[PDB]
Amino acid sequence: VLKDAVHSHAESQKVLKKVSQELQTKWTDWENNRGPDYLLHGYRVIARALQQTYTEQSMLIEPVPQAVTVAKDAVTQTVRGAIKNLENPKPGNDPDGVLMQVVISLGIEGPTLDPGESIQNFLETRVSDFGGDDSDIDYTSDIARLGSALDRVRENHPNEMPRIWIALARELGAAVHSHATSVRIANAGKNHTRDVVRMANESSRLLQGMKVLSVGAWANTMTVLIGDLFA
């Protein structure tokens, strides 16, 4: 390589760990001290990232196999399950957000995953990440249906994946907005929209920089933020 780029890669590795640590210290201070505003800034960042995959994947769109229609049906079914688990649980269960946390991770991170990792492996990894291995609900059939439908499309015709990301991102973005207003109204008298907007802009510029530097590092930091949302 150029000597020059090899030196810049090391400098980038150092900047990357500094930004990750600064993000997590900012978020721990904000969650600790700024209460509900922290959660609302979280939803704002998540909504922005979903809008990002919505627009970028919309740019990529240039007969369409049945596997695509099956994948679209699997994402609506699974997102429905995620929201039901979170906001209208069965009699005898408590609200559970991990399925929502994993499908949001998929909407945000899925388009930039390495081809070598299957969607099914991604989903299982993030169920583990969000503490879902010790839970009350079985996510097995939900994540199975999503993972198999999406991996069928990703193996047979990856160039068709945008149609799925688009539909996933759009629906999730709407669900986030609806849910954010519920949290916001629940905290009437304590909301500071100026601080939410500022916090969301700081977080987003640091996360976007991190994403250009290392998509896996960005995805792990995003996992931390998403873990604080959806109860």
Residue numbers in the entry: 11 to 72, 79 to 247
Copy the relevant paper text.
To elucidate how SemD functions at the molecular level, we determined the 3D structure of the protein, N-terminally truncated up to and including the APH motif (SemDΔAPH67-382) at a resolution of 2.1 Å. The resulting structure revealed that the C-terminal portion of SemDΔAPH (aa 138-382) folds into a rigid core, consisting of nine α-helices, which is N-terminally flanked by a long intrinsically disordered region (IDR, aa 67-137). Owing to its flexibility, the latter is not visible in the electron density. Within the electron density, the amino acids are clearly visible, except for the connecting loop between helices 2 and 3, which is presumably flexible; here, the side-chains were not included in the final model. Furthermore, electrostatic analysis of the rigid core of SemD revealed a large, negatively charged patch on the front of the protein and a smaller positively charged patch on the back. We found that SemDΔAPH is a monomer in solution and the p(r) function indicated a globular core – corresponding to the helical core domain revealed by the X-ray structure – and an elongated tail. Helices α1 and α2 of SemD’s rigid core carry the two predicted WH2 sequences essential for G-actin binding. Our SemD structure implies that WH2_1 on α-helix 1 is largely available for interaction with G-actin, while WH2_2 on α-helix 2 is not fully accessible, suggesting that WH2_1 might constitute the G-actin binding domain.
To enter epithelial cells, the obligate intracellular pathogen Chlamydia pneumoniae secretes early effector proteins, which bind to and modulate the host-cell’s plasma membrane and recruit several pivotal endocytic host proteins. During a Cpn infection, the C-terminus of the membrane-bound SemD interacts with the BR-GBD domain of N-WASP, thus triggering N-WASP activation and Arp2/3-mediated actin polymerisation via an unknown mechanism.
